[PDB]
Amino acid sequence: NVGSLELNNLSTAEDVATLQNQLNKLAEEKHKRSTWKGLTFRIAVQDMWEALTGIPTDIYQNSGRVSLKELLTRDDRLRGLGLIFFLVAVVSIFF
């Protein structure tokens, strides 16, 4: 009985698409849950990929003029610093 309008879906979508709105937002929900589940405690082997993404991109973040700490570390990078666990295990094996 009333008109309620959703402005955007994290990317402004003009009121032209009809089913593209459902497909896009279903893909959005799928991506969000995929990232949540692959970003929680339960990880199998993805730590290697996260570390390999962390190091070069963490270094490159300072190759820009600035990079906010909320983005230098929280952009899927915090566990990307999980390789320090590997290196400390290695040296503790040594030392």
């Binding site: 309620s4 969000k32 990232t35 999980g82 666990f85």
Partner: protein
């Protein structure tokens, strides 16, 4: 001396791996089609009553 900071990082990085789960917080809302009769009624109606809504 060195072993102290090594163990410090050893526990701290596990703590970080525990911490990192909190970052992603997306909102979930689903979409569904109108009932056919209600859809026809809404499309037929001429006046909107309330002007606009943003959510």
């Amino acid at each position: 001396f060195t072993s102290f900071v090594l163990m410090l990082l050893f526990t701290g990085i596990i703590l970080i791996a525990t911490n990192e789960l909190t970052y992603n917080r997306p909102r979930e809302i689903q979409y569904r089609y109108l009932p056919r009769d209600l859809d026809s009624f809404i499309r037929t109606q001429e006046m909107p009553s309330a002007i606009f809504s943003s959510m």
